[PDB]
Design an enzyme around this catalytic site. Structure first.
Site, PDB file in Angstrom:
ATOM      1  N   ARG D 106     -52.288 -11.258 -10.080  1.00 17.46           N
ATOM      2  CA  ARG D 106     -51.291 -11.002 -11.135  1.00 17.46           C
ATOM      3  C   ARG D 106     -49.953 -11.624 -10.776  1.00 17.46           C
ATOM      4  NH1 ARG D 106     -52.942  -5.122 -13.731  1.00 17.46           N
ATOM      5  NH2 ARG D 106     -54.944  -4.892 -12.592  1.00 17.46           N
ATOM      6  N   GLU D 129     -58.949 -20.969   0.688  1.00 12.81           N
ATOM      7  CA  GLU D 129     -58.209 -22.022  -0.024  1.00 12.81           C
ATOM      8  C   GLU D 129     -57.112 -21.367  -0.844  1.00 12.81           C
ATOM      9  OE1 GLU D 129     -62.267 -22.516  -1.399  1.00 12.81           O
ATOM     10  OE2 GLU D 129     -62.242 -22.018   0.749  1.00 12.81           O
TER      11      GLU D 129
HETATM   12  C1  LIG Z   1     -66.947 -18.766   0.187  1.00 15.62           C
HETATM   13  C2  LIG Z   1     -66.527 -19.145   1.568  1.00 15.62           C
HETATM   14  C3  LIG Z   1     -67.469 -19.230   2.567  1.00 15.62           C
HETATM   15  N1  LIG Z   1     -67.119 -19.565   3.823  1.00 15.62           N
HETATM   16  C4  LIG Z   1     -68.142 -19.663   4.876  1.00 15.62           C
HETATM   17  C5  LIG Z   1     -69.351 -18.741   4.687  1.00 15.62           C
HETATM   18  C6  LIG Z   1     -70.474 -19.698   4.301  1.00 15.62           C
HETATM   19  O1  LIG Z   1     -71.791 -19.308   4.708  1.00 15.62           O
HETATM   20  C7  LIG Z   1     -70.056 -21.016   4.931  1.00 15.62           C
HETATM   21  C8  LIG Z   1     -70.678 -22.249   4.282  1.00 15.62           C
HETATM   22  O2  LIG Z   1     -70.484 -22.180   2.877  1.00 15.62           O
HETATM   23  P1  LIG Z   1     -71.287 -23.191   1.949  1.00 15.62           P
HETATM   24  O3  LIG Z   1     -70.964 -22.957   0.527  1.00 15.62           O
HETATM   25  O4  LIG Z   1     -72.771 -23.198   2.161  1.00 15.62           O
HETATM   26  O5  LIG Z   1     -70.687 -24.590   2.460  1.00 15.62           O
HETATM   27  P2  LIG Z   1     -71.565 -25.954   2.444  1.00 15.62           P
HETATM   28  O6  LIG Z   1     -72.923 -25.751   1.773  1.00 15.62           O
HETATM   29  O7  LIG Z   1     -70.718 -27.029   1.810  1.00 15.62           O
HETATM   30  O8  LIG Z   1     -71.754 -26.293   3.985  1.00 15.62           O
HETATM   31  P3  LIG Z   1     -73.013 -25.762   4.776  1.00 15.62           P
HETATM   32  O9  LIG Z   1     -73.797 -27.016   5.181  1.00 15.62           O
HETATM   33  O10 LIG Z   1     -72.544 -25.121   6.040  1.00 15.62           O
HETATM   34  O11 LIG Z   1     -73.818 -24.785   3.943  1.00 15.62           O
HETATM   35  O12 LIG Z   1     -68.627 -20.994   4.798  1.00 15.62           O
HETATM   36  C9  LIG Z   1     -65.754 -19.850   4.116  1.00 15.62           C
HETATM   37  O13 LIG Z   1     -65.369 -20.168   5.280  1.00 15.62           O
HETATM   38  N2  LIG Z   1     -64.826 -19.794   3.149  1.00 15.62           N
HETATM   39  C10 LIG Z   1     -65.124 -19.455   1.900  1.00 15.62           C
HETATM   40  O14 LIG Z   1     -64.201 -19.397   1.052  1.00 15.62           O
HETATM   41  C1  LIG Z   2     -61.126  -8.374 -11.700  1.00 17.24           C
HETATM   42  C2  LIG Z   2     -60.077  -7.534 -12.352  1.00 17.24           C
HETATM   43  C3  LIG Z   2     -60.014  -6.170 -12.098  1.00 17.24           C
HETATM   44  N1  LIG Z   2     -59.088  -5.401 -12.694  1.00 17.24           N
HETATM   45  C4  LIG Z   2     -59.060  -3.958 -12.414  1.00 17.24           C
HETATM   46  C5  LIG Z   2     -60.416  -3.423 -11.994  1.00 17.24           C
HETATM   47  C6  LIG Z   2     -60.269  -3.027 -10.541  1.00 17.24           C
HETATM   48  O1  LIG Z   2     -61.034  -1.841 -10.223  1.00 17.24           O
HETATM   49  C7  LIG Z   2     -58.782  -2.823 -10.409  1.00 17.24           C
HETATM   50  C8  LIG Z   2     -58.271  -3.077  -9.007  1.00 17.24           C
HETATM   51  O2  LIG Z   2     -58.721  -4.309  -8.488  1.00 17.24           O
HETATM   52  P1  LIG Z   2     -58.414  -4.661  -6.948  1.00 17.24           P
HETATM   53  O3  LIG Z   2     -59.019  -6.013  -6.674  1.00 17.24           O
HETATM   54  O4  LIG Z   2     -58.878  -3.606  -5.962  1.00 17.24           O
HETATM   55  O5  LIG Z   2     -56.806  -4.725  -6.869  1.00 17.24           O
HETATM   56  P2  LIG Z   2     -56.031  -4.268  -5.552  1.00 17.24           P
HETATM   57  O6  LIG Z   2     -57.075  -4.058  -4.473  1.00 17.24           O
HETATM   58  O7  LIG Z   2     -54.976  -5.279  -5.217  1.00 17.24           O
HETATM   59  O8  LIG Z   2     -55.300  -2.894  -5.888  1.00 17.24           O
HETATM   60  P3  LIG Z   2     -55.955  -1.451  -5.657  1.00 17.24           P
HETATM   61  O9  LIG Z   2     -55.096  -0.711  -4.641  1.00 17.24           O
HETATM   62  O10 LIG Z   2     -55.917  -0.737  -6.991  1.00 17.24           O
HETATM   63  O11 LIG Z   2     -57.398  -1.584  -5.212  1.00 17.24           O
HETATM   64  O12 LIG Z   2     -58.191  -3.721 -11.327  1.00 17.24           O
HETATM   65  C9  LIG Z   2     -58.156  -6.002 -13.580  1.00 17.24           C
HETATM   66  O13 LIG Z   2     -57.265  -5.318 -14.148  1.00 17.24           O
HETATM   67  N2  LIG Z   2     -58.176  -7.310 -13.840  1.00 17.24           N
HETATM   68  C10 LIG Z   2     -59.083  -8.115 -13.281  1.00 17.24           C
HETATM   69  O14 LIG Z   2     -59.089  -9.348 -13.534  1.00 17.24           O
END
Ligand SMILES: Cc1cn([C@H]2C[C@H](O)[C@@H](COP(=O)(O)OP(=O)(O)OP(=O)(O)O)O2)c(=O)[nH]c1=O
Ligand SMILES: Cc1cn([C@H]2C[C@H](O)[C@@H](COP(=O)(O)OP(=O)(O)OP(=O)(O)O)O2)c(=O)[nH]c1=O
Ligand SMILES: Cc1cn([C@H]2C[C@H](O)[C@@H](COP(=O)(O)OP(=O)(O)OP(=O)(O)O)O2)c(=O)[nH]c1=O
Ligand SMILES: Cc1cn([C@H]2C[C@H](O)[C@@H](COP(=O)(O)OP(=O)(O)OP(=O)(O)O)O2)c(=O)[nH]c1=O
Ligand SMILES: Cc1cn([C@H]2C[C@H](O)[C@@H](COP(=O)(O)OP(=O)(O)OP(=O)(O)O)O2)c(=O)[nH]c1=O
Ligand SMILES: Cc1cn([C@H]2C[C@H](O)[C@@H](COP(=O)(O)OP(=O)(O)OP(=O)(O)O)O2)c(=O)[nH]c1=O
Ligand SMILES: [Mg+2]
Ligand SMILES: [Mg+2]
Ligand SMILES: [Mg+2]
Ligand SMILES: [Mg+2]
Ligand SMILES: [Mg+2]
Ligand SMILES: [Mg+2]
Ligand SMILES: [Mg+2]
Lengths: 189, 189, 188, 188, 189, 188
Positions: D106, D129
């Site tokens: 937000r 990222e």
């Molecule tokens: C979603 C996410 C995963 N990860 C970790 C957990 C995942 O198992 C790992 C690989 O994600 P993948 O999406 O599988 O990356 P890739 O397929 O391009 O490379 P790989 O050959 O290793 O599969 O990265 C992150 O570090 N950052 C992220 O935001």
């Molecule tokens: C995904 C999403 C959830 N929500 C609602 C549903 C979730 O149960 C609620 C909280 O999401 P959270 O991701 O838990 O937000 P937060 O963790 O920063 O704050 P909190 O202390 O309340 O946990 O918000 C939205 O209002 N907008 C959205 O886009």
């Protein structure tokens, strides 16, 4: 032919070039430094889908004024309109050129853009197109130096000066940050 | 009154207008083409939250120099500071105007940005605010022509030229891409 | 020294400054208003990875023409090349300066950018770098006023005017929105 | 099948799901909140002209660390890499999904990109990222909650888990904000 | 309940989950890696002034295909539509979720637009919303891995699957990068 | 385990999953389409210099409502907050995931920032982070379908659901486009 500091003061104290309020310490070697006013216009309409220079678009801009002592914050890639503190009256044998200041340019503040000419016979405040190209927001302080103005001699006096009805001038005697008036007398093919 | 090629060369070889190093083949019909240096400043600070023209912000920029033979890469929507290869010394009866070159403009490379004037009596290198508005990065090659400079006659010699203490000048004898110095003598409300 | 309206007309009707087609109602106190043509160039190539001013990059731009009566739509943060309707011929003792119009600047339309100089002896149409800095797209109508042009006196006639072979000029007699020719005679 | 708070705690204290350092007050109804590390990578190279996923591009990023007590400032439209404080070890019968927090969304803070999967058998820190879509810079404080992680049951244990040589995994046991390794085993 | 590699292969070789062409080396611990096709759509119209999800806007996109062996260049802050090489046919008791790959996310390539779900019964190619948030252009090579796809068990088969007329589905059996069809059955206040 | 249409309707008509107002024709094979409300928040403050998640920043946003029958215009690269027409009440054994719609994604309309989780026990409207990545403005019509919501079964009921005081929940029973509340209980 470009007026120097000596010849600028001479024009001002003879009453032929008007600057109000005038301040002698703002006179530079070749130009005169100008200051930012305290009103701005922001483009924050949410009804229009596009800008058509051929139509008047009334609610395209909003008037904003910083709380006193506070700055106006210009966000990266935002575009606003501002005004000069001073009121300029040019005679019909001088032309003006408005440029930014190097100190501000170096910060990423573009201070007018694309628009040079102040026409002979023009009288009013100057509208400033303020733009930020840096990756941080810039705080603008009302009353700060924002630009500078130099004067060119014309070959001969203007036959039909600015504001005269033969010229069809849109902005004679303008006050605040004035919105665009291009719809007036708009031509096309 | 604008100096032509004939009268520009005359000013240079009489030693009243300084260009160093001077190259005759850079003289154009109405102006003189200027070249890009090999030092840049990038805005890559991650501590500051905003730019305040009223404060000196030391670590706002970093000095960068391409590896020799390699280009500096200007990314779309990036803003950097650059410098001229040449050092300019203007007399107190001439003013300069700096503009970009049409060949570069057409590629989406802006050179001057909001700013125009070069004050009578100025001496030093010129800082360039370089910007990219195309959708691809542009490779800048040190030593390339980057812009052009023309000279205007003043009506009479400047009474208090640039660098004189009455003008309060911030950039006399500047060397590299020099950061902004607007905080010096800053006025407001 | 800057030509006033009186002296501008005098130059035009004596045939020393060429404007074609000329329209007297476009003469302003200190300048002459110029009109947008109906051809544009857009940067829509998807093969090149970068712009090198030192290389000619042929397919960097495409020619586009609005369907007649329709506008060209300039998107926010887009950059295009346009042309003037008029063809300008300057003598060898005059220089020109091209600036935008205050009415359009206030809308967020930047008309040239970073370039002011028209060289003595230049002949051709003028290429315009058009840019949008507002947050809405702008409709450009062909034939609309897009800018203005003033003339400066030179101290003496140009020894080697624009288009003369000593100047090495790239754009003499240009027609449409002409792409960049910087690769020609490129130094580094 | 999505694990609840009850069943998450049960996985952690039985040692099958590793979180280190673990903090019980971070457990939420359906997930567990994760915290930002103090190292970042910025894209501030000026030599490369383009990103080719097929080539390794070593100096594409620089490591940066806020001075202690100070925040890292994420500028509008900037993109940076960050890391989780915690180290995660998933078993070979659970999968993880990483999502941002609504409090930060937000504010305009995009916290991971368009990616969610944490493969069964993954072990290491998570690279984030980070992206800002507001018009103002955002200050990120090291150690702040930055996202949240929930666990899905698999239909059956993974035959060739992450890190196994049949999967060909690039990031097993990663530490800081790790640059991309897509060039490894690149197909086209 | 999320299908593992073991159970994914079992679905594919039993003919209930269709992937064409299928390649076994693309199966990952919890998902299956998918490849980029060689057709794109770019948003390069200059007639429309705005996007209205309520109207069909035919010429909003152009079809582009890299010359063979050459890459498609995605500029910073550009948005294009791409397609999957594979054609997917889901049964009526499985749901799919599409996510990008970590290796590409770390380069600044966003592979879709906030979108996720693939509906039980869906059959066709998948349209990809491709985006660049880095400051350099990215070269996309046709046939490259571009994302990954996992499968969730439903609590019970779908009563009115995707493509069935009760669902009112817009994209059943889609081929290339397909433009938006939101105008079909559009509701508002 | 993901609820199908059959089982979603069953949850709604049994009163365990609340949607108000409910409309049966919005139920899709695996999810339920949700509609845009008529209030927005814009980030148009000009006093603040940066966003600090650790401070409450009151006047960061303004409430805006399109004139009736008119659309809200989302500009390219703008970011606004919106709300769902419907009010959701989830039980303590279901979790929700919010995603955009493919028809809108293809137009360049991002509809939530990085987040996705709806916590078990949550009750209220859902705040939507709306974003434009096309090069033209998009007109959003109040009451339009804007997104979709699917339900996941939990392994077992949440011990301390959303809104319970042990979870420390910031948004229970939220109404309009609610601004961020991250300053509440902020750690670093
Ligand atoms: C979603 C996410 C995963 N990860 C970790 C957990 C995942 O198992 C790992 C690989 O994600 P993948 O999406 O599988 O990356 P890739 O397929 O391009 O490379 P790989 O050959 O290793 O599969 O990265 C992150 O570090 N950052 C992220 O935001
Ligand atoms: C995904 C999403 C959830 N929500 C609602 C549903 C979730 O149960 C609620 C909280 O999401 P959270 O991701 O838990 O937000 P937060 O963790 O920063 O704050 P909190 O202390 O309340 O946990 O918000 C939205 O209002 N907008 C959205 O886009
Ligand atoms: C300012 C401007 C000039 N021109 C015309 C008039 C100028 O005399 C001509 C050249 O401008 P120059 O600035 O001299 O372009 P250049 O120096 O890169 O190339 P050259 O070798 O030709 O000198 O271009 C435009 O087409 N568009 C413009 O915006
Ligand atoms: C136009 C321009 C000028 N200059 C040089 C030449 C000018 O004489 C000098 C100062 O320009 P100014 O525009 O006068 O800068 P300033 O008014 O903010 O600071 P000062 O108090 O010194 O007047 O900077 C550049 O370095 N870069 C440029 O782009
Ligand atoms: C350059 C500039 C001028 N002005 C003033 C001085 C000019 O004489 C006046 C008009 O500039 P013009 O460029 O002549 O604007 P225009 O031609 O679109 O409209 P008009 O019919 O009035 O001629 O505006 C500004 O307010 N702001 C600026 O930035
Ligand atoms: C997530 C995703 C789905 N799809 C496919 C699989 C989905 O089952 C199908 C429709 O997705 P939906 O999200 O349902 O799109 P929609 O509701 O706007 O349109 P419809 O009336 O058809 O439901 O599109 C893509 O082509 N690209 C994508 O990125
Ligand atoms: Mg000065
Ligand atoms: Mg030249
Ligand atoms: Mg005019
Ligand atoms: Mg939470
Ligand atoms: Mg993988
Ligand atoms: Mg649907
Ligand atoms: Mg998501």
């Amino acid at each position: 032919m470009l007026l120097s500091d000596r010849d600028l003061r001479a024009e001002i104290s003879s009453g032929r070039l008007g600057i109000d309020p005038f301040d002698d310490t703002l006179v530079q070697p070749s130009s005169i430094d100008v200051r930012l006013d305290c009103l701005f216009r922001v483009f924050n309409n949410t009804r229009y889908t596009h800008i058509d220079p051929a139509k008047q678009q009334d609610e395209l801009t909003s008037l904003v004024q910083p709380v006193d002592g506070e700055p106006f914050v210009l966000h990266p890639g935002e575009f606003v309109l501002g005004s000069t503190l001073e009121l300029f009256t040019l005679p019909d044998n001088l032309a003006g050129r408005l440029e930014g200041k190097s100190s501000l340019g170096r910060l990423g503040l573009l201070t007018h853009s694309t628009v040079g000419f102040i026409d002979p016979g023009f009288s009013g405040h100057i509208t400033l197109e303020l733009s930020n190209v840096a990756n941080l927001p810039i705080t603008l302080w009302p009353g700060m130096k924002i630009g500078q103005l130099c004067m060119l001699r014309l070959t001969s006096p203007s036959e039909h000066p600015y504001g005269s009805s033969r010229a069809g001038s849109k902005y004679q005697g303008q006050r605040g940050p004035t919105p665009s008036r291009s719809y007036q007398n708009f031509i096309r093919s």
